[PDB]
Amino acid sequence: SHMTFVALYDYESRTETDLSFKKGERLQIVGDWWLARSLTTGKTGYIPSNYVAPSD
Ligand SMILES: COC[C@H]1O[C@@H]2O[C@H]3[C@H](O)[C@@H](OC)[C@@H](O[C@H]4[C@H](O)[C@@H](O)[C@@H](O[C@H]5[C@H](O)[C@@H](O)[C@@H](O[C@H]6[C@H](OC)[C@@H](O)[C@@H](O[C@H]7[C@H](OC)[C@@H](OC)[C@@H](O[C@H]8[C@H](O)[C@@H](OC)[C@@H](O[C@H]1[C@H](O)[C@H]2OC)O[C@@H]8CO)O[C@@H]7CO)O[C@@H]6CO)O[C@@H]5CO)O[C@@H]4CO)O[C@@H]3CO
Ligand SMILES: [Cu+2]
């Protein structure tokens, strides 16, 4: 129940392995970088964990 998060800020991907997202986008979490799946786009990639907070 605790592995869904919401983006607190916009983030633009820098590399081939990170995931861009918009503030308010929800991310399912599959360290400082977490593997996540966007619940908007379905794309998977790494996100900065400090940019997201738990979402119920
Ligand atoms: C056309 O709609 C038919 C479909 O209707 C219902 O699905 C709803 C779904 O329930 C609803 O969910 C709340 C929403 O879906 C949204 C997703 O939840 C959300 O994650 C996101 O989706 C993302 C995906 O996560 C990404 O993976 C990506 O998807 C694209 C695929 O990349 C992996 C790409 O390959 C291509 O998908 C094809 C697919 O190839 C895998 C192909 O399968 C043979 C075919 O899909 C069929 C499907 O097999 C069949 O299911 C039995 C049926 O699906 C219906 C659902 O069952 C029904 O659920 C209640 O028909 C499909 C279409 O014919 O075709 C796929 C489309 O080409 O393309 C993917 C799209 O880009 O990116 C998406 C989008 O960001 O967003 C979703 C909404 O956009 O809506 C669904 C329908 O609107
Ligand atoms: Cu949980």
PDB file of C-alpha atoms and ligand atoms in Angstrom:
ATOM      1  CA  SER A   1       0.000   0.000   0.000  1.00  0.00           C
ATOM      2  CA  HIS A   2       3.022   2.233   0.591  1.00  0.00           C
ATOM      3  CA  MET A   3       4.838   2.043  -2.751  1.00  0.00           C
ATOM      4  CA  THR A   4       2.860   4.692  -4.625  1.00  0.00           C
ATOM      5  CA  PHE A   5       4.390   8.163  -4.621  1.00  0.00           C
ATOM      6  CA  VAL A   6       3.547  11.540  -6.108  1.00  0.00           C
ATOM      7  CA  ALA A   7       5.948  13.982  -7.701  1.00  0.00           C
ATOM      8  CA  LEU A   8       6.498  17.114  -5.635  1.00  0.00           C
ATOM      9  CA  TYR A   9       8.293  18.884  -8.494  1.00  0.00           C
ATOM     10  CA  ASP A  10       8.719  18.587 -12.245  1.00  0.00           C
ATOM     11  CA  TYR A  11      11.786  16.640 -13.353  1.00  0.00           C
ATOM     12  CA  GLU A  12      13.432  16.439 -16.786  1.00  0.00           C
ATOM     13  CA  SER A  13      15.398  13.307 -17.682  1.00  0.00           C
ATOM     14  CA  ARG A  14      19.170  13.748 -18.079  1.00  0.00           C
ATOM     15  CA  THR A  15      20.225  10.296 -19.206  1.00  0.00           C
ATOM     16  CA  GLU A  16      18.959   7.142 -20.846  1.00  0.00           C
ATOM     17  CA  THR A  17      17.950   5.583 -17.547  1.00  0.00           C
ATOM     18  CA  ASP A  18      16.050   8.291 -15.656  1.00  0.00           C
ATOM     19  CA  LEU A  19      12.376   9.108 -16.031  1.00  0.00           C
ATOM     20  CA  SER A  20      10.885  12.556 -16.597  1.00  0.00           C
ATOM     21  CA  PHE A  21       7.727  13.441 -14.718  1.00  0.00           C
ATOM     22  CA  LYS A  22       5.384  16.306 -13.883  1.00  0.00           C
ATOM     23  CA  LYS A  23       4.425  17.645 -10.468  1.00  0.00           C
ATOM     24  CA  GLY A  24       1.423  15.600  -9.337  1.00  0.00           C
ATOM     25  CA  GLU A  25       2.289  12.578 -11.494  1.00  0.00           C
ATOM     26  CA  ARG A  26       2.034   9.355  -9.527  1.00  0.00           C
ATOM     27  CA  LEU A  27       4.844   6.826  -9.608  1.00  0.00           C
ATOM     28  CA  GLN A  28       4.836   3.214  -8.471  1.00  0.00           C
ATOM     29  CA  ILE A  29       8.156   2.271  -6.923  1.00  0.00           C
ATOM     30  CA  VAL A  30       9.425  -1.024  -8.312  1.00  0.00           C
ATOM     31  CA  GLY A  31      19.135   4.659  -2.192  1.00  0.00           C
ATOM     32  CA  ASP A  32      18.794   8.132  -3.688  1.00  0.00           C
ATOM     33  CA  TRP A  33      17.482   6.921  -7.049  1.00  0.00           C
ATOM     34  CA  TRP A  34      14.560   4.527  -7.204  1.00  0.00           C
ATOM     35  CA  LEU A  35      13.247   2.452 -10.084  1.00  0.00           C
ATOM     36  CA  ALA A  36       9.707   3.583 -10.748  1.00  0.00           C
ATOM     37  CA  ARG A  37       6.887   3.200 -13.224  1.00  0.00           C
ATOM     38  CA  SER A  38       4.937   6.297 -14.133  1.00  0.00           C
ATOM     39  CA  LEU A  39       1.218   5.825 -13.547  1.00  0.00           C
ATOM     40  CA  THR A  40       0.613   8.438 -16.268  1.00  0.00           C
ATOM     41  CA  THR A  41       2.848   7.148 -19.063  1.00  0.00           C
ATOM     42  CA  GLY A  42       3.625   3.572 -17.998  1.00  0.00           C
ATOM     43  CA  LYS A  43       7.312   4.227 -18.633  1.00  0.00           C
ATOM     44  CA  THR A  44       9.832   2.796 -16.192  1.00  0.00           C
ATOM     45  CA  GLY A  45      13.079   4.402 -15.136  1.00  0.00           C
ATOM     46  CA  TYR A  46      14.984   5.890 -12.247  1.00  0.00           C
ATOM     47  CA  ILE A  47      13.721   8.850 -10.282  1.00  0.00           C
ATOM     48  CA  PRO A  48      15.316  10.977  -7.567  1.00  0.00           C
ATOM     49  CA  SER A  49      13.647   9.735  -4.361  1.00  0.00           C
ATOM     50  CA  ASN A  50      13.713  13.197  -2.758  1.00  0.00           C
ATOM     51  CA  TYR A  51      11.470  14.501  -5.572  1.00  0.00           C
ATOM     52  CA  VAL A  52       8.523  12.290  -4.586  1.00  0.00           C
ATOM     53  CA  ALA A  53       6.452  11.715  -1.480  1.00  0.00           C
ATOM     54  CA  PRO A  54       4.044   8.965  -0.429  1.00  0.00           C
ATOM     55  CA  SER A  55       0.617   9.001  -2.089  1.00  0.00           C
ATOM     56  CA  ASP A  56      -2.375   6.948  -0.872  1.00  0.00           C
TER      57      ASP A  56
HETATM   58  C1  LIG B   1      -7.733   1.197 -27.095  1.00  0.00           C
HETATM   59  O1  LIG B   1      -8.122   0.817 -25.774  1.00  0.00           O
HETATM   60  C2  LIG B   1      -8.378  -0.586 -25.647  1.00  0.00           C
HETATM   61  C3  LIG B   1      -8.235  -0.993 -24.177  1.00  0.00           C
HETATM   62  O2  LIG B   1      -9.255  -0.291 -23.452  1.00  0.00           O
HETATM   63  C4  LIG B   1      -9.168  -0.467 -22.043  1.00  0.00           C
HETATM   64  O3  LIG B   1      -7.892  -0.013 -21.595  1.00  0.00           O
HETATM   65  C5  LIG B   1      -7.916   1.235 -20.915  1.00  0.00           C
HETATM   66  C6  LIG B   1      -7.317   1.040 -19.523  1.00  0.00           C
HETATM   67  O4  LIG B   1      -8.083   0.131 -18.737  1.00  0.00           O
HETATM   68  C7  LIG B   1      -7.258   2.406 -18.850  1.00  0.00           C
HETATM   69  O5  LIG B   1      -6.634   2.226 -17.585  1.00  0.00           O
HETATM   70  C8  LIG B   1      -7.199   3.017 -16.543  1.00  0.00           C
HETATM   71  C9  LIG B   1      -6.469   3.383 -19.704  1.00  0.00           C
HETATM   72  O6  LIG B   1      -5.140   2.897 -19.887  1.00  0.00           O
HETATM   73  C10 LIG B   1      -4.100   3.796 -19.508  1.00  0.00           C
HETATM   74  C11 LIG B   1      -3.047   2.990 -18.751  1.00  0.00           C
HETATM   75  O7  LIG B   1      -3.604   2.481 -17.542  1.00  0.00           O
HETATM   76  C12 LIG B   1      -1.808   3.827 -18.461  1.00  0.00           C
HETATM   77  O8  LIG B   1      -0.811   2.990 -17.870  1.00  0.00           O
HETATM   78  C13 LIG B   1      -1.290   4.433 -19.762  1.00  0.00           C
HETATM   79  O9  LIG B   1      -0.918   3.366 -20.642  1.00  0.00           O
HETATM   80  C14 LIG B   1       0.387   3.446 -21.208  1.00  0.00           C
HETATM   81  C15 LIG B   1       1.039   2.079 -21.049  1.00  0.00           C
HETATM   82  O10 LIG B   1       1.313   1.752 -19.682  1.00  0.00           O
HETATM   83  C16 LIG B   1       2.343   2.048 -21.840  1.00  0.00           C
HETATM   84  O11 LIG B   1       2.853   0.710 -21.842  1.00  0.00           O
HETATM   85  C17 LIG B   1       2.182   2.516 -23.286  1.00  0.00           C
HETATM   86  O12 LIG B   1       1.361   1.580 -23.974  1.00  0.00           O
HETATM   87  C18 LIG B   1       1.628   1.452 -25.373  1.00  0.00           C
HETATM   88  C19 LIG B   1       2.301   0.097 -25.567  1.00  0.00           C
HETATM   89  O13 LIG B   1       3.621   0.132 -25.025  1.00  0.00           O
HETATM   90  C20 LIG B   1       3.903  -0.979 -24.174  1.00  0.00           C
HETATM   91  C21 LIG B   1       2.364  -0.198 -27.061  1.00  0.00           C
HETATM   92  O14 LIG B   1       2.890  -1.500 -27.326  1.00  0.00           O
HETATM   93  C22 LIG B   1       0.970  -0.099 -27.686  1.00  0.00           C
HETATM   94  O15 LIG B   1       0.099  -1.024 -27.029  1.00  0.00           O
HETATM   95  C23 LIG B   1      -0.635  -1.842 -27.928  1.00  0.00           C
HETATM   96  C24 LIG B   1      -0.587  -3.292 -27.457  1.00  0.00           C
HETATM   97  O16 LIG B   1       0.752  -3.769 -27.569  1.00  0.00           O
HETATM   98  C25 LIG B   1       1.261  -4.237 -26.323  1.00  0.00           C
HETATM   99  C26 LIG B   1      -1.511  -4.173 -28.285  1.00  0.00           C
HETATM  100  O17 LIG B   1      -1.629  -5.467 -27.692  1.00  0.00           O
HETATM  101  C27 LIG B   1      -1.778  -6.497 -28.668  1.00  0.00           C
HETATM  102  C28 LIG B   1      -2.921  -3.591 -28.367  1.00  0.00           C
HETATM  103  O18 LIG B   1      -3.563  -3.591 -27.081  1.00  0.00           O
HETATM  104  C29 LIG B   1      -4.930  -4.038 -27.088  1.00  0.00           C
HETATM  105  C30 LIG B   1      -5.157  -4.956 -25.882  1.00  0.00           C
HETATM  106  O19 LIG B   1      -4.430  -6.177 -26.086  1.00  0.00           O
HETATM  107  C31 LIG B   1      -6.622  -5.291 -25.615  1.00  0.00           C
HETATM  108  O20 LIG B   1      -6.710  -5.871 -24.308  1.00  0.00           O
HETATM  109  C32 LIG B   1      -7.291  -7.170 -24.280  1.00  0.00           C
HETATM  110  C33 LIG B   1      -7.524  -4.065 -25.655  1.00  0.00           C
HETATM  111  O21 LIG B   1      -7.237  -3.190 -24.566  1.00  0.00           O
HETATM  112  C34 LIG B   1      -8.332  -2.501 -23.948  1.00  0.00           C
HETATM  113  C35 LIG B   1      -8.282  -2.780 -22.443  1.00  0.00           C
HETATM  114  O22 LIG B   1      -8.515  -4.164 -22.162  1.00  0.00           O
HETATM  115  C36 LIG B   1      -9.311  -1.941 -21.693  1.00  0.00           C
HETATM  116  O23 LIG B   1      -9.115  -2.094 -20.290  1.00  0.00           O
HETATM  117  C37 LIG B   1     -10.315  -1.848 -19.560  1.00  0.00           C
HETATM  118  O24 LIG B   1      -7.260  -3.357 -26.865  1.00  0.00           O
HETATM  119  C38 LIG B   1      -5.912  -2.875 -26.987  1.00  0.00           C
HETATM  120  C39 LIG B   1      -5.848  -1.924 -28.187  1.00  0.00           C
HETATM  121  O25 LIG B   1      -6.258  -2.579 -29.400  1.00  0.00           O
HETATM  122  O26 LIG B   1      -2.838  -2.247 -28.838  1.00  0.00           O
HETATM  123  C40 LIG B   1      -2.087  -1.388 -27.970  1.00  0.00           C
HETATM  124  C41 LIG B   1      -2.206   0.035 -28.499  1.00  0.00           C
HETATM  125  O27 LIG B   1      -1.404   0.176 -29.674  1.00  0.00           O
HETATM  126  O28 LIG B   1       0.455   1.216 -27.507  1.00  0.00           O
HETATM  127  C42 LIG B   1       0.311   1.563 -26.127  1.00  0.00           C
HETATM  128  C43 LIG B   1      -0.315   2.965 -26.088  1.00  0.00           C
HETATM  129  O29 LIG B   1       0.674   3.995 -26.217  1.00  0.00           O
HETATM  130  O30 LIG B   1       1.592   3.813 -23.282  1.00  0.00           O
HETATM  131  C44 LIG B   1       0.293   3.837 -22.683  1.00  0.00           C
HETATM  132  C45 LIG B   1      -0.343   5.218 -22.843  1.00  0.00           C
HETATM  133  O31 LIG B   1       0.448   6.190 -22.151  1.00  0.00           O
HETATM  134  O32 LIG B   1      -2.323   5.212 -20.374  1.00  0.00           O
HETATM  135  C46 LIG B   1      -3.470   4.441 -20.733  1.00  0.00           C
HETATM  136  C47 LIG B   1      -4.486   5.332 -21.446  1.00  0.00           C
HETATM  137  O33 LIG B   1      -3.861   5.960 -22.569  1.00  0.00           O
HETATM  138  O34 LIG B   1      -7.071   3.515 -20.993  1.00  0.00           O
HETATM  139  C48 LIG B   1      -7.122   2.271 -21.698  1.00  0.00           C
HETATM  140  C49 LIG B   1      -7.742   2.544 -23.065  1.00  0.00           C
HETATM  141  O35 LIG B   1      -7.938   3.959 -23.187  1.00  0.00           O
HETATM  142 CU    CU B   2       2.798  -0.970   0.476  1.00  0.00          CU
END
